[PDB]
PDB file of C-alpha atoms and ligand atoms in Angstrom:
ATOM      1  CA  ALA C   1      37.140-172.767-139.741  1.00 50.74           C
ATOM      2  CA  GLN C   2      34.873-170.020-138.101  1.00 53.09           C
ATOM      3  CA  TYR C   3      37.325-170.214-134.966  1.00 54.22           C
ATOM      4  CA  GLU C   4      40.721-170.697-135.917  1.00 52.50           C
ATOM      5  CA  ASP C   5      44.282-170.913-133.934  1.00 52.56           C
ATOM      6  CA  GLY C   6      46.071-167.736-134.760  1.00 53.64           C
ATOM      7  CA  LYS C   7      42.711-165.910-135.190  1.00 54.78           C
ATOM      8  CA  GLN C   8      40.319-165.294-132.251  1.00 57.40           C
ATOM      9  CA  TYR C   9      43.014-167.563-129.856  1.00 56.02           C
ATOM     10  CA  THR C  10      46.243-168.935-129.652  1.00 57.40           C
ATOM     11  CA  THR C  11      47.396-172.434-128.857  1.00 55.63           C
ATOM     12  CA  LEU C  12      50.303-172.482-125.867  1.00 55.00           C
ATOM     13  CA  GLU C  13      53.430-174.234-126.661  1.00 54.62           C
ATOM     14  CA  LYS C  14      54.022-175.079-123.214  1.00 59.83           C
ATOM     15  CA  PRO C  15      50.213-175.819-122.155  1.00 60.62           C
ATOM     16  CA  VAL C  16      49.786-175.608-118.332  1.00 60.15           C
ATOM     17  CA  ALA C  17      49.068-178.650-116.102  1.00 58.53           C
ATOM     18  CA  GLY C  18      46.256-178.152-113.669  1.00 56.63           C
ATOM     19  CA  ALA C  19      45.505-174.232-114.584  1.00 55.29           C
ATOM     20  CA  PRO C  20      42.423-172.735-113.767  1.00 59.88           C
ATOM     21  CA  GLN C  21      39.481-173.344-116.220  1.00 61.77           C
ATOM     22  CA  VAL C  22      39.116-169.934-117.477  1.00 64.80           C
ATOM     23  CA  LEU C  23      41.701-167.503-116.203  1.00 66.85           C
ATOM     24  CA  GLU C  24      41.947-163.689-116.749  1.00 64.33           C
ATOM     25  CA  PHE C  25      44.745-161.253-115.727  1.00 62.88           C
ATOM     26  CA  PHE C  26      44.905-157.403-115.371  1.00 61.66           C
ATOM     27  CA  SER C  27      46.286-154.602-113.873  1.00 60.26           C
ATOM     28  CA  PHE C  28      44.563-151.209-112.388  1.00 56.55           C
ATOM     29  CA  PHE C  29      47.495-149.483-113.829  1.00 55.24           C
ATOM     30  CA  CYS C  30      46.587-151.168-117.349  1.00 54.20           C
ATOM     31  CA  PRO C  31      44.585-148.841-119.774  1.00 52.85           C
ATOM     32  CA  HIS C  32      43.210-151.420-122.151  1.00 55.09           C
ATOM     33  CA  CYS C  33      42.432-153.206-118.667  1.00 52.79           C
ATOM     34  CA  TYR C  34      40.309-150.187-117.803  1.00 50.46           C
ATOM     35  CA  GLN C  35      38.472-150.590-120.990  1.00 51.04           C
ATOM     36  CA  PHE C  36      38.066-153.957-120.725  1.00 52.57           C
ATOM     37  CA  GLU C  37      36.266-153.864-117.428  1.00 52.97           C
ATOM     38  CA  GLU C  38      35.130-150.434-116.979  1.00 51.49           C
ATOM     39  CA  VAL C  39      33.437-149.545-120.293  1.00 48.75           C
ATOM     40  CA  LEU C  40      33.577-153.133-122.339  1.00 44.35           C
ATOM     41  CA  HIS C  41      32.786-155.641-118.998  1.00 43.81           C
ATOM     42  CA  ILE C  42      34.713-158.249-120.736  1.00 45.62           C
ATOM     43  CA  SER C  43      34.788-160.350-117.372  1.00 51.03           C
ATOM     44  CA  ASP C  44      30.882-160.071-116.678  1.00 45.60           C
ATOM     45  CA  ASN C  45      29.962-160.942-120.343  1.00 47.24           C
ATOM     46  CA  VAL C  46      32.559-163.986-120.644  1.00 47.65           C
ATOM     47  CA  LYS C  47      31.234-164.851-117.222  1.00 48.61           C
ATOM     48  CA  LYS C  48      27.470-164.812-118.403  1.00 49.15           C
ATOM     49  CA  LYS C  49      28.409-167.524-121.058  1.00 46.06           C
ATOM     50  CA  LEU C  50      30.153-169.773-119.540  1.00 43.39           C
ATOM     51  CA  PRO C  51      29.186-173.610-119.688  1.00 43.48           C
ATOM     52  CA  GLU C  52      27.759-174.652-116.527  1.00 43.05           C
ATOM     53  CA  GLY C  53      30.428-175.951-114.121  1.00 46.09           C
ATOM     54  CA  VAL C  54      33.013-173.751-115.796  1.00 44.54           C
ATOM     55  CA  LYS C  55      34.618-171.003-113.169  1.00 45.83           C
ATOM     56  CA  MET C  56      36.147-167.906-114.029  1.00 42.73           C
ATOM     57  CA  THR C  57      39.354-166.836-112.141  1.00 44.77           C
ATOM     58  CA  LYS C  58      40.918-163.349-112.042  1.00 46.07           C
ATOM     59  CA  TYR C  59      44.074-162.084-110.849  1.00 45.78           C
ATOM     60  CA  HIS C  60      46.305-158.990-110.667  1.00 44.76           C
ATOM     61  CA  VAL C  61      49.708-158.610-111.942  1.00 46.92           C
ATOM     62  CA  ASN C  62      52.784-157.063-110.765  1.00 46.00           C
ATOM     63  CA  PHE C  63      54.856-156.204-113.840  1.00 46.40           C
ATOM     64  CA  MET C  64      52.991-152.351-114.084  1.00 47.99           C
ATOM     65  CA  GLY C  65      53.398-149.742-111.088  1.00 46.61           C
ATOM     66  CA  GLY C  66      56.533-150.819-109.381  1.00 45.38           C
ATOM     67  CA  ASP C  67      55.775-150.980-105.591  1.00 46.56           C
ATOM     68  CA  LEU C  68      52.327-149.627-106.038  1.00 44.82           C
ATOM     69  CA  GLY C  69      51.637-152.422-108.697  1.00 47.06           C
ATOM     70  CA  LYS C  70      52.470-154.924-105.876  1.00 46.40           C
ATOM     71  CA  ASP C  71      50.578-152.984-103.514  1.00 46.07           C
ATOM     72  CA  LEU C  72      47.540-153.510-105.679  1.00 45.97           C
ATOM     73  CA  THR C  73      48.216-157.369-106.184  1.00 45.03           C
ATOM     74  CA  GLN C  74      48.056-157.582-102.466  1.00 43.15           C
ATOM     75  CA  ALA C  75      45.189-155.458-101.982  1.00 42.66           C
ATOM     76  CA  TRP C  76      43.251-157.545-105.236  1.00 43.76           C
ATOM     77  CA  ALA C  77      44.601-160.761-102.574  1.00 42.24           C
ATOM     78  CA  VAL C  78      42.551-158.836 -99.800  1.00 41.94           C
ATOM     79  CA  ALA C  79      39.452-158.157-102.068  1.00 38.74           C
ATOM     80  CA  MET C  80      39.175-161.890-103.136  1.00 41.67           C
ATOM     81  CA  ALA C  81      39.468-163.234 -99.537  1.00 38.29           C
ATOM     82  CA  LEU C  82      36.957-160.896 -98.569  1.00 40.50           C
ATOM     83  CA  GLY C  83      35.043-161.588-101.615  1.00 40.49           C
ATOM     84  CA  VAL C  84      34.405-157.552-102.184  1.00 40.38           C
ATOM     85  CA  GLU C  85      35.622-157.761-105.737  1.00 42.33           C
ATOM     86  CA  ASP C  86      32.063-156.135-106.929  1.00 44.56           C
ATOM     87  CA  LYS C  87      32.630-153.477-104.316  1.00 47.17           C
ATOM     88  CA  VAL C  88      36.191-152.248-105.011  1.00 48.93           C
ATOM     89  CA  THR C  89      37.002-153.012-108.637  1.00 50.67           C
ATOM     90  CA  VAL C  90      35.103-149.702-109.861  1.00 49.73           C
ATOM     91  CA  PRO C  91      37.072-147.418-107.412  1.00 47.65           C
ATOM     92  CA  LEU C  92      40.386-149.050-107.551  1.00 47.67           C
ATOM     93  CA  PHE C  93      40.226-148.793-111.291  1.00 49.23           C
ATOM     94  CA  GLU C  94      39.323-144.661-111.103  1.00 49.16           C
ATOM     95  CA  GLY C  95      41.448-144.238-108.318  1.00 51.39           C
ATOM     96  CA  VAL C  96      44.504-145.294-110.303  1.00 47.96           C
ATOM     97  CA  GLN C  97      43.614-143.981-113.624  1.00 46.10           C
ATOM     98  CA  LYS C  98      40.553-141.359-113.633  1.00 47.53           C
ATOM     99  CA  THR C  99      41.342-139.283-110.224  1.00 47.73           C
ATOM    100  CA  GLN C 100      44.719-140.547-110.020  1.00 48.54           C
ATOM    101  CA  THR C 101      44.202-140.401-105.912  1.00 45.87           C
ATOM    102  CA  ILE C 102      45.893-143.675-105.425  1.00 48.10           C
ATOM    103  CA  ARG C 103      49.394-143.407-105.058  1.00 48.65           C
ATOM    104  CA  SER C 104      50.013-145.255-101.929  1.00 52.17           C
ATOM    105  CA  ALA C 105      49.126-148.578-100.155  1.00 49.47           C
ATOM    106  CA  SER C 106      47.142-146.120 -97.494  1.00 49.16           C
ATOM    107  CA  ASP C 107      45.129-144.340-100.528  1.00 51.84           C
ATOM    108  CA  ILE C 108      44.234-148.037-101.874  1.00 51.28           C
ATOM    109  CA  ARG C 109      43.021-149.030 -98.079  1.00 52.86           C
ATOM    110  CA  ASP C 110      41.145-145.807 -98.410  1.00 56.92           C
ATOM    111  CA  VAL C 111      38.788-147.191-101.145  1.00 58.89           C
ATOM    112  CA  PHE C 112      37.961-150.567 -99.221  1.00 61.34           C
ATOM    113  CA  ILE C 113      37.109-148.102 -96.147  1.00 59.25           C
ATOM    114  CA  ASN C 114      34.710-146.016 -98.323  1.00 57.98           C
ATOM    115  CA  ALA C 115      33.228-149.116 -99.664  1.00 59.77           C
ATOM    116  CA  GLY C 116      32.292-150.132 -96.146  1.00 57.46           C
ATOM    117  CA  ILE C 117      35.030-152.552 -95.744  1.00 56.61           C
ATOM    118  CA  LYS C 118      35.916-152.277 -91.728  1.00 55.98           C
ATOM    119  CA  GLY C 119      39.510-150.826 -91.168  1.00 55.12           C
ATOM    120  CA  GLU C 120      40.175-153.920 -88.771  1.00 54.08           C
ATOM    121  CA  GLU C 121      38.886-156.418 -91.080  1.00 56.77           C
ATOM    122  CA  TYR C 122      40.941-154.933 -93.857  1.00 58.12           C
ATOM    123  CA  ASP C 123      44.167-154.740 -91.739  1.00 55.72           C
ATOM    124  CA  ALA C 124      43.947-158.398 -90.702  1.00 52.78           C
ATOM    125  CA  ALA C 125      43.190-159.432 -94.037  1.00 52.95           C
ATOM    126  CA  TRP C 126      46.396-157.224 -95.433  1.00 50.38           C
ATOM    127  CA  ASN C 127      48.835-158.913 -93.060  1.00 46.52           C
ATOM    128  CA  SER C 128      47.203-162.628 -92.994  1.00 49.46           C
ATOM    129  CA  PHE C 129      49.023-165.469 -94.456  1.00 51.33           C
ATOM    130  CA  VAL C 130      45.852-166.492 -96.394  1.00 51.22           C
ATOM    131  CA  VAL C 131      46.330-163.200 -98.201  1.00 47.75           C
ATOM    132  CA  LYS C 132      49.919-163.998 -98.960  1.00 46.01           C
ATOM    133  CA  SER C 133      49.206-167.461 -99.758  1.00 46.46           C
ATOM    134  CA  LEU C 134      46.588-165.665-102.378  1.00 48.11           C
ATOM    135  CA  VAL C 135      49.242-163.376-103.627  1.00 44.50           C
ATOM    136  CA  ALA C 136      51.310-166.486-104.081  1.00 44.38           C
ATOM    137  CA  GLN C 137      48.612-167.818-106.170  1.00 48.12           C
ATOM    138  CA  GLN C 138      48.545-164.992-108.347  1.00 44.85           C
ATOM    139  CA  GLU C 139      52.270-164.792-108.826  1.00 42.38           C
ATOM    140  CA  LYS C 140      52.396-168.615-109.847  1.00 39.51           C
ATOM    141  CA  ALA C 141      49.738-168.483-112.538  1.00 40.02           C
ATOM    142  CA  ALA C 142      51.163-165.658-114.303  1.00 42.02           C
ATOM    143  CA  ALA C 143      54.593-166.825-114.128  1.00 40.62           C
ATOM    144  CA  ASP C 144      53.044-170.553-115.380  1.00 43.47           C
ATOM    145  CA  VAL C 145      52.181-168.538-118.651  1.00 42.76           C
ATOM    146  CA  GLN C 146      55.393-166.384-118.580  1.00 41.86           C
ATOM    147  CA  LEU C 147      52.926-163.499-118.566  1.00 40.43           C
ATOM    148  CA  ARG C 148      54.224-159.949-119.810  1.00 40.66           C
ATOM    149  CA  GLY C 149      51.081-158.282-121.018  1.00 38.67           C
ATOM    150  CA  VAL C 150      47.800-157.813-120.163  1.00 38.21           C
ATOM    151  CA  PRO C 151      44.951-157.791-120.224  1.00 38.40           C
ATOM    152  CA  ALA C 152      45.164-161.436-120.793  1.00 37.62           C
ATOM    153  CA  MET C 153      42.895-164.370-120.759  1.00 37.03           C
ATOM    154  CA  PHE C 154      43.719-168.264-120.609  1.00 40.98           C
ATOM    155  CA  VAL C 155      41.213-171.205-121.169  1.00 39.98           C
ATOM    156  CA  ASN C 156      42.324-174.646-119.409  1.00 38.92           C
ATOM    157  CA  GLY C 157      46.233-173.688-119.497  1.00 40.03           C
ATOM    158  CA  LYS C 158      45.926-174.529-123.159  1.00 40.89           C
ATOM    159  CA  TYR C 159      44.529-171.234-125.302  1.00 40.10           C
ATOM    160  CA  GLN C 160      45.278-167.759-124.958  1.00 35.98           C
ATOM    161  CA  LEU C 161      42.470-165.317-126.259  1.00 34.76           C
ATOM    162  CA  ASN C 162      43.666-163.057-128.922  1.00 35.16           C
ATOM    163  CA  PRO C 163      41.227-160.115-129.314  1.00 35.11           C
ATOM    164  CA  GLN C 164      43.264-158.217-131.473  1.00 32.91           C
ATOM    165  CA  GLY C 165      41.929-161.167-133.892  1.00 34.98           C
ATOM    166  CA  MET C 166      38.577-160.608-133.197  1.00 36.11           C
ATOM    167  CA  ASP C 167      37.538-159.216-136.455  1.00 33.18           C
ATOM    168  CA  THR C 168      34.696-156.647-135.577  1.00 33.23           C
ATOM    169  CA  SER C 169      34.683-152.546-135.774  1.00 31.25           C
ATOM    170  CA  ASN C 170      31.621-152.489-133.574  1.00 28.76           C
ATOM    171  CA  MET C 171      32.568-152.734-129.409  1.00 29.60           C
ATOM    172  CA  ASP C 172      29.578-154.649-128.215  1.00 30.72           C
ATOM    173  CA  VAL C 173      29.881-157.359-130.730  1.00 30.33           C
ATOM    174  CA  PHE C 174      33.623-157.339-130.088  1.00 34.35           C
ATOM    175  CA  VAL C 175      32.974-158.076-126.390  1.00 39.39           C
ATOM    176  CA  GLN C 176      30.146-160.834-127.393  1.00 37.03           C
ATOM    177  CA  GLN C 177      32.877-162.326-129.745  1.00 36.57           C
ATOM    178  CA  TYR C 178      35.192-162.634-127.088  1.00 35.66           C
ATOM    179  CA  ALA C 179      32.815-164.311-124.877  1.00 33.18           C
ATOM    180  CA  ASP C 180      31.485-166.687-127.637  1.00 35.40           C
ATOM    181  CA  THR C 181      35.376-167.611-128.206  1.00 33.60           C
ATOM    182  CA  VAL C 182      36.050-168.341-124.525  1.00 32.81           C
ATOM    183  CA  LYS C 183      32.574-170.277-124.663  1.00 33.21           C
ATOM    184  CA  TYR C 184      34.009-171.955-127.513  1.00 34.44           C
ATOM    185  CA  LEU C 185      37.356-172.808-126.242  1.00 35.74           C
ATOM    186  CA  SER C 186      35.995-174.037-122.901  1.00 35.28           C
ATOM    187  CA  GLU C 187      34.023-176.566-124.816  1.00 32.57           C
ATOM    188  CA  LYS C 188      36.903-177.698-126.789  1.00 32.41           C
TER     189      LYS C 188
HETATM  190  C1  62J O 201      44.111-156.239-125.317  1.00 31.28           C
HETATM  191  O1  62J O 201      43.722-156.125-126.596  1.00 31.28           O
HETATM  192  C2  62J O 201      43.126-154.685-126.692  1.00 31.28           C
HETATM  193  O2  62J O 201      43.104-153.760-125.744  1.00 31.28           O
HETATM  194  C3  62J O 201      42.664-154.219-128.068  1.00 31.28           C
HETATM  195  C4  62J O 201      41.207-153.321-128.043  1.00 31.28           C
HETATM  196  C5  62J O 201      40.770-152.900-129.242  1.00 31.28           C
HETATM  197  C6  62J O 201      40.574-153.675-130.411  1.00 31.28           C
HETATM  198  C7  62J O 201      39.433-153.191-131.365  1.00 31.28           C
HETATM  199  N1  62J O 201      38.999-154.364-131.854  1.00 31.28           N
HETATM  200  C8  62J O 201      37.399-154.688-131.455  1.00 31.28           C
HETATM  201  C9  62J O 201      36.761-153.072-130.935  1.00 31.28           C
HETATM  202  C10 62J O 201      35.733-152.575-131.869  1.00 31.28           C
HETATM  203  C11 62J O 201      35.248-151.021-131.402  1.00 31.28           C
HETATM  204  C12 62J O 201      35.669-150.704-130.157  1.00 31.28           C
HETATM  205  C13 62J O 201      36.770-151.465-129.180  1.00 31.28           C
HETATM  206  C14 62J O 201      36.868-150.736-127.807  1.00 31.28           C
HETATM  207  C15 62J O 201      36.243-149.569-126.816  1.00 31.28           C
HETATM  208  C16 62J O 201      36.883-149.508-125.572  1.00 31.28           C
HETATM  209  S1  62J O 201      38.075-150.197-126.014  1.00 31.28           S
HETATM  210  C17 62J O 201      38.399-150.876-127.120  1.00 31.28           C
HETATM  211  C18 62J O 201      37.132-152.774-129.654  1.00 31.28           C
HETATM  212  C19 62J O 201      40.956-155.210-130.038  1.00 31.28           C
HETATM  213  C20 62J O 201      41.154-155.355-128.869  1.00 31.28           C
END
């Protein structure tokens, strides 16, 4: 077939009941994740091709970066709670991997302040139980698929994208194959 299990996607042996329709995982420490987001814009090109009524969920993970990796999962919870993902994703990636100026929780907070989130608003979110719940949700979704590597994307708890199996040497063609595969899975 044109789309083949083991080719552009694999099939989870233990499918996850009640999972998000389209679930992406990343770390701000993850070099391929920087490429996926900052250079290929995978999330955006996937989102822009999802069928009507299909939503995209994107969560951070703890298993890279030790202490600071957990702080970033908490900050991503703050970004989701405040709805400022589109303001902070670029400076967080660049702060961790390009300028390497993010070395502490305070340096993460500086990115939000520079992006125009008020200090009071950030600190309130950071310490909130709504954010603790969002951290818990991020951790559970990753645990449910026994996640040990990023970037990763899952569709309906059943299928895992396999970009290494998208047989093209062109990066924009790669991006659109990836997006077209998510659309195909979402329709399955
Ligand atoms: C987690 O899996 C991965 O990260 C790998 C990454 C590269 C690989 C190459 N096949 C597609 C392709 C062709 C040409 C260029 C680029 C490209 C440009 C900036 S980053 C990657 C990708 C497939 C997936």
